[PDB]
Design a protein around this nucleic acid. Structure first.
Ligand SMILES: [Mg+2]
Ligand SMILES: [Mg+2]
Ligand SMILES: [Mg+2]
Ligand SMILES: [Mg+2]
Ligand SMILES: [Mg+2]
Ligand SMILES: [Mg+2]
Ligand SMILES: [Mg+2]
Ligand SMILES: [Mg+2]
Ligand SMILES: [Mg+2]
Ligand SMILES: [Mg+2]
Lengths: 55, 106, 117, 14, 88
RNA sequence: AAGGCGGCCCCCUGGACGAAGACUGACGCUCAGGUGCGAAAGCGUGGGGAGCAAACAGGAUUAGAUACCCUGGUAGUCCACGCCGUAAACGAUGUCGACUUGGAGGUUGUGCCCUUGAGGCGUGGCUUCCGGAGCUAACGCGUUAAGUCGACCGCCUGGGGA
């Protein structure tokens, strides 16, 4: 159901340094949390989100 | 039959060669009973980080319903061509027909 | 003798030594100063006051280019992270950017063994 | 412990 | 195991109707076609000892199912062993 | 199944679990030999070589430094092809089945419900921490038992020798 193309959802789930916010802070379900992890890793290859705040 | 989402980006200096690669790859798919669901041209798009010393990459999003004949040849001609700098395919759950959030905002 | 007016401070912070280095936005180095040659050796070298005088002495060798707006690039987990930024403002500069540029490997290589004491 | 085990080999008297 | 066209056809081949799917002779054929499907796989993938456990599970499962038909009705047993190429 | 298994993507492939029915009709449990898997080190042949690092080189330390600490560094760590089959290979609990008050949760489904919110009400699979009865030498276990029982197998008989 979740998808990697809606990057505005992915901007709310990352930091300024490109780090993935865990489900402890956001309070989301663990079913989506494994899916949100691989959905960012799809977008990490396609140059949609930066890895770190270095570059 | 599998359901594929094919993501490939084109070198920005050959952005006019993109509609040639759209219809040449499609005729090999549809001849061997391959369906098609989504074909969206996005133009140039700013990169989150530089790749191959370039900026403003061309993006084309695809959805292809086809058997495993085209999955052998199309990934090799992506590595054979120098215009395609990144190639990525993925298996999806069903045949889907829905506009991307990039088209719905632009 | 030359005008650039845009500074970049790649400052280093190790456990043993802190190195302040001024450069431009295009990699061309302009001056450096280490805490070893500032009158601080060994245990005195691993002091935050040694980083207070290393940033000031390196700043005195880069005022020939007329730099007013500089960028601070902090690299390393070593002590003295605060004493070297306040020393840049004590030298008469307009501090603009502060950025942690500490290299973080993604478990690339194997770390060395423990130091049991 | 099992009786069916002792059919194969009885208890070893020292 | 297989697709829907490969599974449902062999049930109609050896079963009396479409509902005859739980019988033992169908269950032998579900394992017989699967082992014959995995002949070229393990030849290329001899280092895959984890899928070999699933292979040795189905070989041991087929051996137990042939022993039930052999001890009850040998007429149906001698049909299937040559109809699928068994007993080697 | 266990040792274990972690960038992403494709291809081949294994098991687990849930819902609704249909169908075979005890087809089952268990296992001495036998068979295969099996951390790392090490061995054989041929590649490969960053970083780390037995032996070793050098410098401090010291009574001496062989070790510690530091600067280097070969084998090995990598891949293919084998072999070796031992570990504190531990949940220090062999497997299967039946029952016996329960909670804090986690994970994974499914059924119904002013859908009146990602909710309410149930109901299976997996999993951790508490804890009653009971058991236990004590520690503790305690619906995943080390409770009460059945089915089968392995193993132990003072320490050292070993
Ligand atoms: Mg499956
Ligand atoms: Mg009947
Ligand atoms: Mg050797
Ligand atoms: Mg050493
Ligand atoms: Mg070797
Ligand atoms: Mg042993
Ligand atoms: Mg324990
Ligand atoms: Mg009590
Ligand atoms: Mg308890
Ligand atoms: Mg003895």
């Amino acid at each position: 159901e979740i998808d990697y193309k809606d990057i505005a959802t992915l901007k709310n789930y990352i930091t300024e340094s490109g780090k993935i916010v865990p489900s402890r802070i956001t309070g989301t379900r663990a079913k989506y949390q494994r899916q949100l992890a691989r959905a960012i890793k799809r977008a990490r290859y396609l140059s949609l989100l930066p890895y770190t705040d270095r570059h | 039959m599998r359901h594929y989402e094919i993501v490939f980006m084109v070198h920005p200096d050959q952005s006019e060669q993109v509609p040639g690669m759209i219809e040449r790859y499609t005729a090999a798919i549809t001849g061997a009973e391959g369906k098609i669901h989504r074909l969206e041209d996005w133009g140039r798009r700013q990169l989150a980080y530089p790749i191959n010393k370039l900026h403003k990459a061309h993006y084309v999003l695809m959805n292809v319903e086809a058997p495993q004949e085209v999955i052998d040849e199309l990934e090799t001609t992506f590595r054979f061509n120098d215009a395609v700098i990144r190639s990525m395919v993925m298996r999806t759950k069903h045949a889907v027909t829905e506009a991307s959030p990039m088209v719905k905002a632009k | 003798r030359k005008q650039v007016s845009d500074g970049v401070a790649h400052i280093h912070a190790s456990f043993n030594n802190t190195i302040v280095t001024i450069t431009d936005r295009q990699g061309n180095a302009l001056g450096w100063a280490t805490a070893g040659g500032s009158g601080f050796r060994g245990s005195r070298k691993s002091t935050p006051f040694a980083a207070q005088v290393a940033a000031e002495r390196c700043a005195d060798a880069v005022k020939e280019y007329g730099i007013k707006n500089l960028e601070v690039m902090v690299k390393g987990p070593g002590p003295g992270r605060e004493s070297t930024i306040r020393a840049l403002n004590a030298a008469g500069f307009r501090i603009t950017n502060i950025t942690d540029v500490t290299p973080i490997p993604h478990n690339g290589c194997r770390p060395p063994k423990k130091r049991r004491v | 412990a099992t009786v069916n085990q002792l059919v194969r080999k009885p208890r070893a008297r020292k | 195991s297989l697709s829907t066209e490969a599974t449902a056809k062999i049930v109609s081949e050896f079963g009396r109707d479409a509902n005859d799917t739980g019988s033992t002779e169908v269950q032998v054929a579900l394992l017989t076609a699967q082992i014959n499907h995995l002949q070229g796989h393990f030849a290329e993938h001899k280092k895959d000892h984890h899928s070999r456990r699933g292979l040795l599970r189905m070989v041991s499962q087929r051996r137990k199912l042939l022993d039930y038909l052999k001890r009850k009705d040998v007429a149906r047993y001698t049909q299937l062993i040559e109809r699928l190429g068994l007993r080697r």
